[PDB]
Write an enzyme that holds these catalytic residues in place. Structure first.
Site, PDB file in Angstrom:
ATOM      1  N   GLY A  99       0.745  -1.236   0.000  1.00 55.80           N
ATOM      2  CA  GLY A  99       0.000   0.000   0.000  1.00 55.80           C
ATOM      3  C   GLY A  99       0.777   1.290   0.000  1.00 55.80           C
ATOM      4  O   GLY A  99       2.006   1.300   0.142  1.00 55.80           O
ATOM      5  N   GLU A 100       0.018   2.373  -0.182  1.00 54.11           N
ATOM      6  CA  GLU A 100       0.504   3.745  -0.230  1.00 54.11           C
ATOM      7  C   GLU A 100       0.205   4.412   1.101  1.00 54.11           C
ATOM      8  O   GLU A 100      -0.873   4.977   1.311  1.00 54.11           O
ATOM      9  CB  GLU A 100      -0.200   4.526  -1.348  1.00 54.11           C
ATOM     10  CG  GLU A 100      -0.195   3.867  -2.733  1.00 54.11           C
ATOM     11  CD  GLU A 100       1.126   4.024  -3.479  1.00 54.11           C
ATOM     12  OE1 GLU A 100       2.038   3.190  -3.291  1.00 54.11           O
ATOM     13  OE2 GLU A 100       1.246   4.978  -4.275  1.00 54.11           O
ATOM     14  N   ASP A 144      -2.596   9.504  15.449  1.00 54.43           N
ATOM     15  CA  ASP A 144      -3.241   9.333  14.159  1.00 54.43           C
ATOM     16  C   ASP A 144      -3.985   7.989  14.063  1.00 54.43           C
ATOM     17  O   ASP A 144      -3.869   7.278  13.067  1.00 54.43           O
ATOM     18  CB  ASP A 144      -2.178   9.489  13.045  1.00 54.43           C
ATOM     19  CG  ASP A 144      -2.775   9.669  11.650  1.00 54.43           C
ATOM     20  OD1 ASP A 144      -3.925  10.145  11.517  1.00 54.43           O
ATOM     21  OD2 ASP A 144      -2.070   9.341  10.672  1.00 54.43           O
ATOM     22  N   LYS A 189       8.694  -0.479   5.433  1.00 49.10           N
ATOM     23  CA  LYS A 189       8.195   0.854   5.118  1.00 49.10           C
ATOM     24  C   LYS A 189       9.327   1.810   4.767  1.00 49.10           C
ATOM     25  O   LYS A 189      10.268   1.968   5.530  1.00 49.10           O
ATOM     26  CB  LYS A 189       7.383   1.401   6.293  1.00 49.10           C
ATOM     27  CG  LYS A 189       6.293   0.443   6.737  1.00 49.10           C
ATOM     28  CD  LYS A 189       5.241   1.127   7.587  1.00 49.10           C
ATOM     29  CE  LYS A 189       4.032   0.223   7.769  1.00 49.10           C
ATOM     30  NZ  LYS A 189       2.886   0.899   8.443  1.00 49.10           N
ATOM     31  N   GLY A 193       5.283   6.717   3.133  1.00 48.63           N
ATOM     32  CA  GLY A 193       5.917   6.177   1.942  1.00 48.63           C
ATOM     33  C   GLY A 193       5.309   4.850   1.548  1.00 48.63           C
ATOM     34  O   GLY A 193       4.231   4.504   2.021  1.00 48.63           O
ATOM     35  N   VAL A 194       5.977   4.106   0.680  1.00 50.39           N
ATOM     36  CA  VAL A 194       5.438   2.819   0.247  1.00 50.39           C
ATOM     37  C   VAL A 194       5.597   1.763   1.354  1.00 50.39           C
ATOM     38  O   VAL A 194       6.512   1.859   2.191  1.00 50.39           O
ATOM     39  CB  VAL A 194       6.162   2.270  -1.008  1.00 50.39           C
ATOM     40  CG1 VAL A 194       5.204   1.458  -1.843  1.00 50.39           C
ATOM     41  CG2 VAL A 194       6.809   3.376  -1.795  1.00 50.39           C
ATOM     42  N   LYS A 211      -6.731   5.277  13.349  1.00 47.09           N
ATOM     43  CA  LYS A 211      -7.745   5.111  12.324  1.00 47.09           C
ATOM     44  C   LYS A 211      -7.795   3.615  12.054  1.00 47.09           C
ATOM     45  O   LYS A 211      -6.829   2.905  12.355  1.00 47.09           O
ATOM     46  CB  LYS A 211      -7.387   5.898  11.055  1.00 47.09           C
ATOM     47  CG  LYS A 211      -6.144   5.420  10.343  1.00 47.09           C
ATOM     48  CD  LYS A 211      -5.987   6.138   9.023  1.00 47.09           C
ATOM     49  CE  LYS A 211      -5.429   7.530   9.197  1.00 47.09           C
ATOM     50  NZ  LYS A 211      -3.952   7.504   9.390  1.00 47.09           N
TER      51      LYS A 211
END
Length: 294
Positions: free
Chosen positions: A11-12, A123, A33, A16-17, A125
């Site tokens: 994933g994005e 953060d 990562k 970063g990737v 989520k």
């Protein structure tokens, strides 16, 4: 890097990737990562290297930090699915309450541990909550916001979600506390129950107003100091508080009482992770195993 064979792009991310890769020396599959330029700030190097030390069963383990050739790669233990995918899969039936209660309980254990070390996530989520086949759930990317300030748009321009952001952050408070993570967790808790995002704002003001319409516009009675917040405006529309029974049906009295305490406006009033583990809602918690197809 060389010691790793990238198997695929998972994933994005924000920084970063993220790739699923196999460490050629240990043979272990891991989450790699790539982060983010002038030659990597030593301060971020120290922040991250401290996270290598706080290990807990409910925290995605930071295995290694590779700062080779002025580049930064973080190697984390690998987990197959996140809560966001699982919720999308259990959209029709919903996630059973016993599983919801087990996951919230484990999440609060991970939070209490990090919080006692003064480490915030900032953060939280669904996308960074990872689950395994044995009924476990772990917090991912803990502490990285502090090391690398959370962006507005990711490296691929994806707009970062404001949905789980605490109101004190939206009102411009610069000195966040552990209370911000409790607010985020309460939002995810409501979402798991109703199968719909609680405050899906699409701008900071829209997010703020969505919060105000539901919980009522804050004032000096419920949140002393609020009118002095950096971005508080006397011109905010004055909305009345909605009844929780209407906000999160069919959550029972214990769950609703707990949620209300996680959603208090005043950060100092908001329940702590440690205090929440003792709440009556967890009286009957168990550890069911999720129905996840890989």
């Amino acid at each position: 890097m060389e010691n790793f064979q990238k198997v695929e792009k998972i994933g994005e991310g924000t920084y970063g990737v993220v790739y699923k890769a196999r460490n050629k020396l240990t043979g272990e599959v891991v989450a790699l990562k790539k982060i983010r330029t002038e030659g990597v700030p030593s301060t971020a190097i120290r922040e991250i290297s401290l996270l290598k030390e706080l290990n807990h069963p409910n925290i995605v383990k930071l295995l290694d930090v590779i700062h080779t050739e002025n580049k930064l790669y973080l190697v984390f233990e690998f987990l197959h699915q996140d809560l966001k995918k699982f919720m999308d899969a259990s959209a029709l039936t919903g996630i059973p309450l016993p599983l919801i209660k087990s996951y919230l309980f484990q999440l609060l254990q991970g939070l209490a541990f990090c919080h006692s070390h003064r480490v915030l996530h900032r953060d939280l989520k669904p996308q960074n909550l990872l689950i395994n086949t044995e009924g476990a759930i772990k917090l991912a990317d803990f502490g990285l916001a502090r090391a690398f300030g959370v962006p507005v748009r990711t490296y691929t321009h994806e707009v970062v979600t404001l949905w789980y952001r605490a109101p004190e952050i939206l009102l411009g408070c610069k000195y966040y506390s552990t209370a911000v993570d409790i607010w985020s967790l309460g939002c995810i808790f409501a979402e798991m129950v109703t199968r719909r995002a609680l405050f899906p704002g699409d701008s900071e003001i829209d997010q703020l107003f969505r919060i105000f319409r539901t919980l009522g516009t804050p004032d000096e009675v419920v949140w002393p100091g609020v009118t002095s917040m950096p971005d508080y405006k006397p011109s905010f529309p004055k909305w009345a508080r909605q009844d929780f029974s209407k906000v999160v049906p069919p959550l029972d009295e214990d769950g609703r009482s707990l949620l209300s305490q996680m959603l208090h406006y005043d950060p100092n009033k908001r329940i702590s992770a440690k205090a929440a583990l003792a709440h009556p809602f967890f009286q009957d918690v168990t550890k069911p195993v999720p129905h996840l197809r890989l």
